[PDB]
């Protein structure tokens, strides 16, 4: 086509989706990770995660307002990944890298899994 | 903070939100523009438009499944802007620029209004 493109548009959309999440506006699901609860937008979760994409395209699960993750999932690892989904920024640290990589593998977030593997390999 | 950032994350999220729109997955509103209907996600519309942000933060309108736009709004102009919201690409042409600018002004999409004004000024 002969379209023009606004370079900062995708980043501006994601920034506003994060502002809606912070103010709890039009969040339509709560993700339960052991004792912890995280409110989010189903569309953003699906857009970022192979696991959520599979869950919310399922004809029965698409209608659930609560999703319980596997008990082995670490709430902090989930929190870091949820923040990444809404910001593009990953808070990866020596103290959380193992939990973040395990959560990214479960959530099917291949680019996160890739950077965790590389950061771990460098420390060996 | 000490975060790392994935450069293509925002663009990848927007690409997946557009794929969900094309397959009509978790769309929660229909925008009526005269005889034409457009299905979309309320969160994306709010993230892109000052008008939709005001509409869906309203305690009564947030729950509506149908929104009717002003009869002066051109369906093609709306279609071009809806495509821009989901892709960052604006199909701006001599034949549609006046309708696109008028629709962007109504929808409160200031960056689109700005490029339309500049493209019009250059043709004068």
């Amino acid at each position: 086509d002969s379209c023009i493109q606004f370079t900062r548009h995708a980043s501006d959309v994601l920034l506003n989706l994060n502002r809606l999440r912070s103010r709890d506006i039009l969040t339509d699901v709560v993700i339960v990770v052991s004792r912890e609860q995280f409110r989010a937008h189903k569309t953003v979760l699906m857009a970022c995660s192979g696991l959520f994409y599979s869950i919310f395209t399922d004809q029965l699960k698409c209608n659930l307002s609560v999703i319980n993750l596997d008990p082995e999932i670490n709430p902090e690892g989930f929190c870091i990944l949820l923040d990444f989904m809404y910001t593009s920024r990953l808070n990866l640290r020596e103290g959380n890298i193992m939990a973040v990589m395990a959560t990214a593998m479960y959530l099917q977030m291949e680019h996160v899994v890739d950077t965790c593997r590389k950061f771990i390999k460098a420390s060996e | 903070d000490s975060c790392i950032q994935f450069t293509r994350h925002a663009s990848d999220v927007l690409l997946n939100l557009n794929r969900l729109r094309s397959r009509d997955i978790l769309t929660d509103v229909v925008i009526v523009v005269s005889r034409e209907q457009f299905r979309a996600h309320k969160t994306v519309l709010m993230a892109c438009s000052g008008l939709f942000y005001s509409i869906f933060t309203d305690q009564l309108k947030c729950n509506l499944s149908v929104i009717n736009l002003d009869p002066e709004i051109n369906p093609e102009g709306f279609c071009i802007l809806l495509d821009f919201m989901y892709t960052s690409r604006l199909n701006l042409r001599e034949g549609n620029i006046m309708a696109v600018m008028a629709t962007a002004m109504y929808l409160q999409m200031e960056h689109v209004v700005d490029t339309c004004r500049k493209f019009i000024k250059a043709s004068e």
Partner: peptide
């Protein structure tokens, strides 16, 4: 704005 750019030519993509």
């Amino acid at each position: 704005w750019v030519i993509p």
